[PDB]
Structure 1
Amino acid sequence: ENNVTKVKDTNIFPYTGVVAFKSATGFVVGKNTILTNKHVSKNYKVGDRITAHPNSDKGNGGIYSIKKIINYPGKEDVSVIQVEERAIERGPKGFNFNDNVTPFKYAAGAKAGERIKVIGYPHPYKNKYVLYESTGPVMSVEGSSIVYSAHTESGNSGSPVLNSNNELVGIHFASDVKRNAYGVYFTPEIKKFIAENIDK
């Protein structure tokens, strides 16, 4: 499927769960904690900034500094990023990261044919910090792999893949040249790693 639409208000759920890197996406999984891809976080360091749910230059939920980066020891393209709880620049709800974002909750599962949404900042260059939502069916779910046919671009690296009830079914990491997109499915092993690394 190729159904990609601009998000008009990024300051409501589910959009408040998404964060922007310079040319990639991530999302909130718990207190002061974001998920993105290793291929994204390899270019960031402690003290670099992330912005919560920006809408171009129209408003955002704050600018936050990275305090810790932890990569999944396994093969899957998953990296945990913790931020300082107190914003560099406040969001509308004040300086606290957690007041300005909404973590996603895992779905019970996913299955071929169900419809998903990939939400993120697709454009590496143009449409800076413009959030889009891209829809399509799940093609397969096998182990730590989820495949879905939804249009994505390179800035979608680190995007949440949500089901129709805005529950988390995967994290996006790649797409085919010019029908399928590939996400990591949250197996118990990956979930255990993420849970151990959510800021206490």
Structure 2
Amino acid sequence: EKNVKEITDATKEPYNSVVAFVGGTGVVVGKNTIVTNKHIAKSNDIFKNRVSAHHSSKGKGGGNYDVKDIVEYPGKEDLAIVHVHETSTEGLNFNKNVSYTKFADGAKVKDRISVIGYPKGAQTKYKMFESTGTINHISGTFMEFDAYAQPGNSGSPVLNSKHELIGILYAGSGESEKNFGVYFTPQLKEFIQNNIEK
């Protein structure tokens, strides 16, 4: 499926839970807590760069926030969580400018999904795009879906028809029209919930 539309204003749910990294995308899951891919978190840590809360072309941004620390998932799964300092250098509060996306118990094959991220964000000046598709395969922690994705879309939220979080993108095949995701089992939901700032 190639149905890709620009989200020109990202101040509303669920788009205000999506954040921009340099190399890709994350989701806001709880207080001061962002979920993304491992290499997105790791390579950002050695440049010590900021994250942008729901940046869009006409939206009015949610601020730019420094990273506190990074917690990686010990297993094989491409999952890292990221903590921010909640006060930006403009004085914006993180938790007043995002929403927390809900989990999504669980998913089935042939479900319609949305992938929201920043494909080729360096070339677009980081426009937010929504891409729709369908889950073809779920096996344990793995899932496959046929929504159009460009790199970019590393760590992009996969949402169901009720704006709830099924998982995140980590890999494409090969422009890509079969892409692979980290499907959030209860065990993965346990890990994320335990690492939300309180």
Asked if TM exceeds 0.5, the reply is yes
1:151: which partner in 2? 148
Question: How far did residue 88 of structure 1 move?
Answer: 2.3
Match in the other structure for 2:178: 180
Q: Note the C-alpha offset of 1:38.
A: 0.2
Aligned to 1:40: 40
* Identity score, percent: 48
Runs of 4+ in 1 over 6 A off after TM superposition: none
**What residue in structure 2 maps to residue 107 of structure 1?**
104
Secondary structure of the structure 2 residue equivalent to 1:28: strand
CA–CA distance in 1 between the matches of 2:146 and 2:53? Answer: 27
2:164 matched to 1:167?
yes
Question: Could you give the per-residue CA deviations for residues 77-96 of structure 1, whole angstroms, max 9, x where no partner exists?
Answer: 00000001112235xxxx21
The alpha-carbon deviation at position 23 of structure 1 amounts to 2.6
TM-score of the two chains, using structure 1 as the length reference = 0.93
Residue 80 of structure 1: aligned partner: 81
Unpaired runs of 5+ in structure 2?
A: none
Aligned match of 1:49: 50
Give 2:113's aligned residue: 116
CA displacement at 1:191 relative to structure 2: 1.3
2:193 paired residue number: 195
1:89 and 1:53 map into 2 onto residues whose CA distance is 16
8 Å contact from structure 2 (residues 11, 59) kept in 1: no
Confirm or deny: 8 A CA contact 1:56 1:127 kept in the other structure.
no
Question: What is the CA–CA distance in structure 2 between the aligned matches of 1:151 and 1:41, rounded to whole Å?
Answer: 23
CA RMSD of aligned residues (A): 1.4
Tell me if structure 1 keeps the 8 A contact 2:116–2:158.
Answer: yes
Residue 86 of structure 1 aligns to a residue whose secondary structure is: coil
Q: So what's the TM-score if we normalise by structure 2?
A: 0.94
Match of 1:140 in 2: 137
Q: Which runs of 5+ in 1 are unaligned?
A: none
Task: Give, as a single letter, the amino acid of the residue that structure 2 aligns with 1:77.
Answer: D
Partner amino acid, structure 1, of 2:185: T
